[PDB]
Structure 1
Amino acid sequence: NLQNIIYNPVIPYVGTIPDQLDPGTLIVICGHVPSDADRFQVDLQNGSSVKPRADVAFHFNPRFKRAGCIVCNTLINEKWGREEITYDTPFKREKSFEIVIMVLKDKFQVAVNGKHTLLYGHRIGPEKIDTLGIYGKVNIHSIGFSGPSSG
């Protein structure tokens, strides 16, 4: 099963990731989108500093207004980079979801509810990631991790 599981965390959630995100590592997040959701985000960060705001290696941001979409980006020295938008979003208000982020050597691969959703190339060395943050309107049931050599 998954390791270092966290159940029913209070949002906003900011926690240290147990192990380095070496290639093949999986981050599994199960939750539900509340009725009043406009957006929420899963951020893989370098630290937990609020001021100055810690760099966000990978910002996964589902948005629900209108047709909906998913915005991905990177924050470095408090400045957002170029956004990468996915218009084919599997998320929707009042529906449960399972997000699986697989950290590969050159990029992140994200699947939602068992379906491939998007790729995001590394802009910050993944070894610099040590914190997981979840913010916005989202209800998280569980957070779990799986190492590449797990068995």
Structure 2
Amino acid sequence: NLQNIIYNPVIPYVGTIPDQLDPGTLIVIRGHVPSDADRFQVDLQNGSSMKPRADVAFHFNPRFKGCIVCNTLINEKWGREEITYDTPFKREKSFEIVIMVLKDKFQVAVNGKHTLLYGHRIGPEKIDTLGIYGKVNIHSIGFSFSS
């Protein structure tokens, strides 16, 4: 039931999500971390506005020094950071990210292994845009919708 919408998108990638993120929806992102990476992010956004900057419902931000920082941007202001230190990401290694949308939270597994949970701060129904930024190569972006 997984239907990819784009292959090898140029980064920064900003795209419209074709259907609503209802409970049970999956977002599947397949990529690869470059040799010189410092960090990258997957942002689930409300709109693609740049001025003013669009709210980010779910900021999923792997940093390579390593860790994953998650947060929410509302009215151009960042909320409280939720930091995961048990990170599966490494440089020169490929990955598969699966984001599960649940009623009350997102659930993320990388490479088949569970990674983290993140409670909704903005109602997921307000998400219509997917943004991927920073140092990362993306092989594919797909959705399995539950509408």
DSSP 3-state at the match of 1:61: strand
2: CA distance, partners of 1:117 / 1:6: 25
Gaps of 5+ in 2: none
Deviations 1:92-131 (A, max 9, x none): 0000000000000000000000000000000000000000
SS in 2 for 1:73: strand
Task: Give the Cα separation in 2 of the matches to 1:127 and 1:116.
Answer: 24
Cα separation, 1, equivalents of 2:85 and 2:104: 23
Contact kept, 8 Å, 2:4 with 2:140, in 1: the verdict is no
User: Which residue does the alignment assign to 1:40?
Assistant: 40
Alpha-carbon contact 1:100-1:110 (below 8 Å) kept: yes
TM-score where L is the length of structure 1: 0.94
CA contact (8 A) 1:4 1:18 kept: no
TM-score by length of 2: 0.97
Q: What is residue 139 of structure 2 aligned with on the other side?
A: 141
Q: Which residue of 2 aligns with 1:96?
A: 94
For 1:21 and 1:115, the matched residues in 2 are separated by 22
Match of 2:122 in 1: 124
Take 1:56 and 1:4, find their aligned partners in 2: how far apart are those partners? 22
- Provide runs of 4+ in structure 1 moved above 6 Å: none
Secondary structure (helix, strand or coil) at the match of 2:21 reads coil
Aligned residues: 146
Equivalent residues of 2:7, 2:141 under 8 A apart? yes
Over the aligned positions, Cα root-mean-square deviation in angstroms equals: 1.3
Unaligned residue ranges in structure 1 (runs of 5+) = none
